[PDB]
Amino acid sequence: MKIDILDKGFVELVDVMGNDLSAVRAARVSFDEERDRHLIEYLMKHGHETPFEHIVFTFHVKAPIFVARQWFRHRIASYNELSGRYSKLSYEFYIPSPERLEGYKTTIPPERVTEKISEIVDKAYRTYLELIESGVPREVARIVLPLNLYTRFFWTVNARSLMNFLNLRADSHAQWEIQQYALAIARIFKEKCPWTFEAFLKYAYKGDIL
Amino acid sequence: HMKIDILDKGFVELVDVMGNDLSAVRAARVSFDLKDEERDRHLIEYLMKHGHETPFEHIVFTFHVKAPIFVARQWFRHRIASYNELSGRYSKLSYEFYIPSPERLEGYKTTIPPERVTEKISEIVDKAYRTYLELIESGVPREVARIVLPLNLYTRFFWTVNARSLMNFLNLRADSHAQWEIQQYALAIARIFKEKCPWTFEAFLKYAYKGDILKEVQ
Amino acid sequence: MKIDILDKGFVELVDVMGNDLSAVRAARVSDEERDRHLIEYLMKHGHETPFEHIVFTFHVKAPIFVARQWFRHRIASYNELSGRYSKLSYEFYIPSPERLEGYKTTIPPERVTEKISEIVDKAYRTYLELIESGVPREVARIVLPLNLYTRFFWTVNARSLMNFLNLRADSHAQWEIQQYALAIARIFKEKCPWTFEAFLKYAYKGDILKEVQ
Amino acid sequence: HMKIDILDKGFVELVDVMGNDLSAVRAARVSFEERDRHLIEYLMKHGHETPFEHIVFTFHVKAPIFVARQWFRHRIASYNELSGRYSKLSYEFYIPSPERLEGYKTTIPPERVTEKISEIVDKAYRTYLELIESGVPREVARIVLPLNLYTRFFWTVNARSLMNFLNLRADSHAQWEIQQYALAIARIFKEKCPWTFEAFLKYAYKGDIL
Ligand SMILES: Cc1cc2nc3c(=O)[nH]c(=O)nc-3n(C[C@H](O)[C@H](O)[C@H](O)COP(=O)(O)OP(=O)(O)OC[C@H]3O[C@@H](n4cnc5c(N)ncnc54)[C@H](O)[C@@H]3O)c2cc1C
Ligand SMILES: Cc1cc2nc3c(=O)[nH]c(=O)nc-3n(C[C@H](O)[C@H](O)[C@H](O)COP(=O)(O)OP(=O)(O)OC[C@H]3O[C@@H](n4cnc5c(N)ncnc54)[C@H](O)[C@@H]3O)c2cc1C
Ligand SMILES: Cc1cc2nc3c(=O)[nH]c(=O)nc-3n(C[C@H](O)[C@H](O)[C@H](O)COP(=O)(O)OP(=O)(O)OC[C@H]3O[C@@H](n4cnc5c(N)ncnc54)[C@H](O)[C@@H]3O)c2cc1C
Ligand SMILES: Cc1cc2nc3c(=O)[nH]c(=O)nc-3n(C[C@H](O)[C@H](O)[C@H](O)COP(=O)(O)OP(=O)(O)OC[C@H]3O[C@@H](n4cnc5c(N)ncnc54)[C@H](O)[C@@H]3O)c2cc1C
Ligand SMILES: O=c1ccn([C@H]2C[C@H](O)[C@@H](CO)O2)c(=O)[nH]1
Ligand SMILES: O=c1ccn([C@H]2C[C@H](O)[C@@H](CO)O2)c(=O)[nH]1
Ligand SMILES: O=c1ccn([C@H]2C[C@H](O)[C@@H](CO)O2)c(=O)[nH]1
Ligand SMILES: O=c1ccn([C@H]2C[C@H](O)[C@@H](CO)O2)c(=O)[nH]1
């Protein structure tokens, strides 16, 4: 499973441990359908969330730095990211579409905002290459690159923490760009843990957009 | 399926595992993609030797453990993990108790024979258990009645833990300063870890393991 | 501040970093009415991270079965007496007869209390005999019952503390830990009155603290 | 209260502290000079680190985003940062000094690298103001700003986690810029917990520069 997001981003599922029944087993402390599904709803409605910690996902995410900064505020998870100091990058940048501004009364056309963003990114990138060419190390030269530069990371997260992430980020108060990522995370979650996901939406989900 | 017996009635059972040694390699490189055994194994050693531990967080285990409460209290001090335990207030229990073997005391100068210590422990547990049943029979709820049961009562739990936190657990508990009973559990955890992540385990022993027992035992 | 709990337990405040204004400063990243209004605003909209910048240290004396529940709260720091090495006072929680009032028992509540006292005395005497004969503490203590009192230090931030109160200052929690949670709430209220009142009004999910002053 | 200036416009300021060296001693003994100092050394040399969690600091930090991204990887701590979406910013940028490049054979003089960095940040900043003036919301407009933009945050952290931070960041493998911040954090730590700090350097500190 891989879902494209924004202009060059994506969320890709790398691995998953367990499924809905992993939470049921943990709740019953028992290794060895209607009753199991009823238990999942029960746990969710009463806030008995610890059993959901025994379901774990690993994702591979490509996102602009400003999105990644918000995402990385979720401390109850594991992250490994490309190195700005040492890694080869593709040097791609998130350029908002004109539709992103639709809704706001701007004194220049949305298409022109897009163009100005693209221009300043190109200038920053060209300054960066000149610095590199003249022998400035990457860890210094890259500081002139803008916040819409794409990075990549691995994210390992359990279903309880993932639900918190969806509560906060799959919500209209979150920035639109990370909402888009959160929708994709939700889709993958739903595919792998349909009972947990449905119970979550029904009883515990605090956001609006799902 | 891996299940190892511990103490007189305890066990550690593997329930599930996400990933393997290559999960750490992929996370370190940030590449979901190009396998090369010698370079991959070299990267695991490199990470371990230089203390780059975050890639090991992407390997995760779930165990099912049966252990006496005094062991579980030590275990549950490891906060970077997930636990679900039987309820003392509401769950059915089997009411089994850890009775140390006479060999457990061999090593200490005692004024009574080790066999007699074992017997006295068995006796007081039986008395406690019988008092407990009398309380239950007379209508005292379990959450109150169970407080007279001793600390060697067995409980069960699920434990989900990543390999980084697992290595911390082994550093601290697979060690002669840890209580002998929890050492026995830690050796079983190590055996399972070794079986599932042999490269990580070997690199851990070689570069990062701070304890004493796992360099001797196998 | 030290509050007695159960028959021999307590909660004592050791230290506190900050006060209500610590959360205000952290939220603003740098007039009492506007500051109090901000605390209510944060609490009402679920902006909880600023409350992480208020921290408490408590010293708690509680029976092991209560401590086991308490220590499930992972987002906190604990240091407890060593069962293997520490000197203990060997005291035990004996429920009062009133603790059983509410349950139809076939023996009088006073008799339940007595039977508990008896079995703890027997366990404790067996323990002393084991110790006297040279059995090390780390082994001998395993015969002691779960109502043995222990002590610990607990360092915890106000956000995690509010989670603790949501779960433990609540009628679904065991009565014994409810009593501890009420004392924690009293101390919290004394040190962070605005946070506490906003918590009760907008975020508290339990039942007992809306009833009990 | 203590404030140390870092880089060209950054700082680390101590906001508050709970406890001191004796807080760790009290927690280790569970009880409310030579023997106390000896206990701190003992704990440190044997890796008995949990008592140090009962010492807690709050800092106020002003640092460039690229430094903040490294810092915020330390999950065992609490953070509150200025909002890129909603907060007023001062719009200041870290411009490396010519001495920062000394050590590297560059084909342009270090002073010219500094100038080029200043230029591209000015251009990015001016593009940003134009976008703002034309009604583009801040959460979109700010994505063109470079990674050397200064941000501010509150950081609450216990001494155990602070020692892990110093092991990793007060070290020559860490980027030079965050080394400077780590040195200031270490200064403050030393001032408030001298026995802990000395024991840490003696027995546990894994880095080189302290
Ligand atoms: C719409 C929106 C606007 C935002 N604006 C800002 C802003 O302007 N500035 C800013 O700095 N941040 C901002 N954030 C980030 C926000 O403050 C949180 O950092 C982020 O939402 C992660 O939430 P969390 O702490 O619940 O998640 P995690 O860090 O994954 O924590 C998960 C859960 O564990 C608990 N937890 C984890 N660590 C601790 C701890 N140390 N103490 C107590 N409990 C803990 C809490 O229960 C938490 O819910 C914003 C977030 C959103 C959604
Ligand atoms: C031989 C031995 C004797 C012991 N004796 C006692 C005793 O007498 N009394 C007692 O109370 N305990 C005792 N313990 C328990 C010990 O203090 C730790 O609670 C236990 O070893 C868990 O270790 P941890 O904190 O490293 O693991 P975890 O809690 O799993 O944490 C793992 C890592 O995450 C970090 N971490 C997690 N949470 C925090 C935080 N809040 N702040 C900073 N860093 C954090 C640390 O880097 C830590 O190493 C003993 C342990 C051993 C092995
Ligand atoms: C009435 C009652 C009955 C109970 N019965 C049982 C029982 O039968 N068996 C049993 O085992 N336990 C039982 N518990 C304990 C319960 O399962 C929790 O362990 C305990 O309430 C601590 O809650 P917490 O996880 O929110 O707290 P903390 O562990 O302090 O965590 C605080 C917050 O941080 C986040 N967090 C911390 N660590 C993680 C993680 N690893 N993954 C995801 N999120 C995390 C969550 O947002 C959490 O709310 C019971 C608790 C109560 C109150
Ligand atoms: C020189 C240098 C280069 C780096 N390069 C990169 C890079 O290229 N890419 C990249 O992504 N990162 C990089 N990092 C960041 C690094 O991987 C860590 O994210 C960062 O150093 C924080 O370390 P920490 O995990 O020990 O701290 P914290 O996250 O504060 O954790 C403190 C301690 O708690 C424990 N802990 C906390 N959470 C968990 C958990 N979920 N599981 C297990 N244990 C836990 C560990 O014991 C840990 O030491 C680099 C760091 C340095 C110093
Ligand atoms: O919607 C938001 C706004 C801000 N931040 C955090 C991320 C970063 O640390 C800082 C940026 O202002 O605050 C978020 O996580 N989400
Ligand atoms: O020295 C470094 C290099 C990288 N990173 C992390 C921070 C950020 O998330 C990403 C930048 O490459 O990796 C660090 O924390 N420290
Ligand atoms: O009300 C309860 C019941 C159980 N537990 C946890 C504590 C211990 O780990 C185990 C005992 O059943 O479950 C609690 O935390 N609170
Ligand atoms: O070897 C030990 C000794 C003590 N403790 C912790 C467990 C419990 O909370 C308390 C009991 O002494 O201290 C351990 O974890 N390991």
CA closest to B111 among chain C residues: C133
| 3-state DSSP percent of chain B in helix, strand and coil, to 5 | 50, 15, 30
> Resolution to 1 decimal, in Å?
1.9
User: What's the gap in Å between A59 CA and the centre of ligand 1?
Assistant: 20
CB count in 10 Å sphere of residue C208: 17
Closest atom, ligand 1, to C-alpha of A168:
53
- Contact at CB, D30 and C153, closer than 8 angstroms: yes
- Contact at CB, D140 and A96, closer than 8 angstroms: yes
Q: Judge whether B15 and B60 are in contact, CB under 8 Å.
A: no
User: What's the gap in Å between C182 CA and the centre of ligand 7?
Assistant: 18
Q: Which CATH class is domain D1-210?
A: alpha beta
d(CA A160, CA A54): 9
- Contact at CB, A54 and B30, closer than 8 angstroms: no
Q: Which residues contact D80 (CB under 8 A, 6 or more apart)?
A: C26, C27, C29, C49, C50, C53, D153, D154
CB count in 10 Å sphere of residue A102: 9
User: CB of B178 closer than 6 A to ligand 8?
Assistant: yes
Q: Judge whether A106 and D135 are in contact, CB under 8 Å.
A: yes
Q: What's the distance, CA B67 to chain centroid?
A: 8
Q: What is the dotted CATH code of the domain comprising B1-218?
A: 3.30.1360.170
Gap from B105 CA to chain A (nearest CA, Å): 33
Best mutation target among C77, C143, C155 (most B Cβ atoms within 10 Å) is C143
Q: Is B183 annotated as a binding residue?
A: no
The ligand whose atoms approach the alpha carbon of B83 most closely is 3
Residue D124 tokens read as 């990015």
- Contact at CB, C106 and B139, closer than 8 angstroms: yes
| Substitution candidate for ligand 8 out of C71, C73, C82 with most atoms within 8 A of CB | C82
d(CA C66, CA C147): 8
d(CA B141, CA A155): 45
CA dihedral A83, A84, A90, A93 (to 10 degrees): 130
Binding site members of D for FAD: 50, 73-76, 81, 158-160, 164
The ligand whose atoms approach the alpha carbon of D75 most closely is 4
3.40.1190.10, 3.30.1360.170, 3.40.50.2000, 1.10.3080.10: which CATH number matches C1-213?
3.30.1360.170
d(CA C46, CA A83): 34
Q: Judge whether C26 and C167 are in contact, CB under 8 Å.
A: no
Angle at D51 between CA B49 and CA B201, to 5 degrees: 25
Task: List the residue whose alpha carbon is closest to atom 2 of ligand 5.
Answer: A70
| Residue C210 CB-density burial (10 A; 0-12 exposed, 13-18 middle, 19+ buried) | exposed
Residue B87 tokens read as 């309820």
Q: Is B76 annotated as a binding residue?
A: yes
Q: At CB < 8 A and 24+ separation, what contacts does C196-201 make? A: C198/C39, C198/C40, C198/C42, C198/C43, C198/C44, C199/C43, C199/C162, C199/C165, C201/C40, C201/C43
C neighbours by CB contacts (3+ pairs under 8 Å): B, D
Using the 8-state DSSP alphabet, how is residue B178 labeled?
A: S
Q: Is A134 annotated as a binding residue?
A: no
- Contact at CB, C29 and D82, closer than 8 angstroms: yes
Q: Where is chain C broken, named by the residue before each break, C–N > 2.5 Å?
A: 30
For chain D, first and last CA: distance in Å? 22
Residue A30 Ramachandran class (φ > 0 left, ψ -120 to 50 alpha, else beta): beta
A neighbours by CB contacts (3+ pairs under 8 Å): B, D
d(CA A203, CA A200): 5
| Substitution candidate for ligand 4 out of D67, D74, D156, D158 with most atoms within 8 A of CB | D74
Q: Please, which residues bridge with residue A93 across strands? A: A149
CB count in 10 Å sphere of residue C146: 22
Of A16, A50, A152, the CB nearest to B82: A50
The crossing angle, in degrees rounded to 10, of helices B37-49 and B21-29 is: 80
Angle at A88 between CA A85 and CA A92, to 5 degrees: 105
The residue among D173, D113, D139, D87 whose CA lies nearest residue A143 is: D113
- Contact at CB, A148 and D148, closer than 8 angstroms: no
Of C68, C103, C134, the CB nearest to B141: C103
The crossing angle, in degrees rounded to 10, of helices A110-133 and D110-133 is: 170
- Contact at CB, D146 and A148, closer than 8 angstroms: no
Q: Which is it for strands B3-6 and A150-158: parallel, antiparallel or unpaired?
A: unpaired
Residues of B in Cβ contact (< 8 Å) with A82: 30
The residue among D141, D121, D122 whose CA lies nearest residue D130 is: D141
Q: Judge whether B159 and C74 are in contact, CB under 8 Å.
A: no
Residues of D in Cβ contact (< 8 Å) with A139: 175
Gap from A123 CA to chain B (nearest CA, Å): 28
Q: Which residues contact A173 (CB under 8 A, 6 or more apart)?
A: none
Residue D12 tokens read as 């680390």
d(CA D207, CA D210): 7
Q: Which helix (H) or strand (E) holds B44?
A: helix B37-49
Of D54, D80, D87, the CB nearest to C49: D80
Residue A71 tokens read as 């995402």
Closest atom, ligand 4, to C-alpha of A78:
41
Gap from D111 CA to chain C (nearest CA, Å): 35
Q: Is C163 annotated as a binding residue?
A: yes
Way the structure was solved: X-ray
Q: Is C70 annotated as a binding residue?
A: yes
Q: Is B193 annotated as a binding residue?
A: no
Best mutation target among A1, A3, A15, A153 (most B Cβ atoms within 10 Å) is A15
DSSP structure string for A26-54: HHHT----HHHHHHHHHHHHTT--GGGGG
d(CA C49, CA A76): 14
CA closest to C80 among chain D residues: D30
Best mutation target among C19, C38, C79 (most D Cβ atoms within 10 Å) is C79
Task: List the residue whose alpha carbon is closest to atom 2 of ligand 8.
Answer: B74
Residues of B in Cβ contact (< 8 Å) with A17: 16-19, 60, 62
Q: Judge whether C58 and C112 are in contact, CB under 8 Å.
A: no
Q: Is C74 annotated as a binding residue?
A: yes
Place of tokens 């809704």: A103
User: What's the gap in Å between A69 CA and the centre of ligand 5?
Assistant: 7
Return the amino acid letter for A161: S
d(CA B161, CA A76): 13
Gap from D64 CA to chain C (nearest CA, Å): 16
Catalytic residue check, B173:
yes
User: HEC profile for chain D?
Assistant: CCEEEECCCEEEEEEEEECCHHHHHHHHHCCCCHHHHHHHHHHHHCCCCHHHHHCEEEEEEEEEHHHHHHHCCCCCCEEEECCCCCCCCCCCECCCCHHHCCCCCCCCCHHHHHHHHHHHHHHHHHHHHHHHHCCCCHHHHHHHCECCEEEEEEEEEEHHHHHHHHHHHCCCCCCHHHHHHHHHHHHHHHHHCHHHHHHHHHHHCCCCCC
d(CA A95, CA A178): 15
Of D73, D116, D124, the CB nearest to A146: D124
Q: Which helix (H) or strand (E) holds A57?
A: strand A56-64
User: What's the gap in Å between D209 CA and the centre of ligand 4?
Assistant: 20
User: HEC profile for chain C?
Assistant: CEEEECCCEEEEEEEEECCHHHHHHHHHCCCHHHHHHHHHHHHHCCCCHHHHHCEEEEEEEEEHHHHHHHCCCCCCEEEECCCCCCCCCCCECCCCHHHCCCCCCCCCHHHHHHHHHHHHHHHHHHHHHHHHCCCCHHHHHHHCECCEEEEEEEEEEHHHHHHHHHHHCCCCCCHHHHHHHHHHHHHHHHHCHHHHHHHHHHHCCCCHHHCCC
Whole-angstrom CA distances from C172 to A160, B81, B131, C99, D163 are 21, 25, 26, 16, 40
Place of tokens 């509010």: C162
- For residue B160, the SS3 value is strand
Residue C161 tokens read as 């503390």
CB count in 10 Å sphere of residue B172: 18
Q: Judge whether D58 and D15 are in contact, CB under 8 Å.
A: yes
The residue among C151, C134, C123 whose CA lies nearest residue B152 is: C123
Of A29, A56, A80, the CB nearest to B28: A80
Half-sphere exposure of A111 (CA within 13 A, CB side): 0
Q: Which helix (H) or strand (E) holds B129?
A: helix B114-137
